[PDB]
Each structure stands twice: as structure tokens, then as C-alpha cells.
Amino acid sequence: MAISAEELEKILKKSFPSSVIKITDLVGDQDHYALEISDAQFNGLSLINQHKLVKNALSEILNKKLHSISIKTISIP
């Protein structure tokens, strides 16, 4: 609950450990965290699959609570 943004990556590591997780502030006012994942596993997937995967990687282990945030997809680091 309200866990640090630096821990948000620890969760994405469950399925994407090598992946590069980074958070960025867009408004710096409300609970709006800009997630940035980079790896060679999100190649070929769709904007829906990439956005869903990140949610599934935490929907199985339930590492972090269920919230809504921006999830940017990056390939070929």
C-alpha cells in the first residue's frame, strides 16, 4: 500500500527481472506513476498484451495492490 516507486520494479522482476523498470512523474501531484519497461520479451506483442502482461505479472503473485497507472512499452534497448 503506497509502497515506494523504487519497489514497483521489484514486482515487475517476477516475470521480467532483466527488464529495465523506471518510474517518472508526469504531474507530480496525484498518484500518477509513469512505468517504463525495456527488454527483448515485449517484441511482437500488441499494446494490449504489453499493458496486460505487466498487470498479469502482479495479478498472479499479488505483490502490489491493484491500481491504475501509465505503462510505457520499450523494445530493443
Curated annotation (Swiss-Prot):
In terms of domain of life, where is this protein from? Answer: Bacteria
Annotated InterPro entries: BolA, BolA-like_sf
The residues forming the signal peptide are: none
Give the SUPFAM superfamilies listed for this entry: BolA-like
Please give the organism. Answer: Rickettsia prowazekii (strain Madrid E)
Upper lineage ranks? Bacteria, Pseudomonadati, Pseudomonadota, Alphaproteobacteria, Rickettsiales
Descriptive protein name: Uncharacterized protein RP812
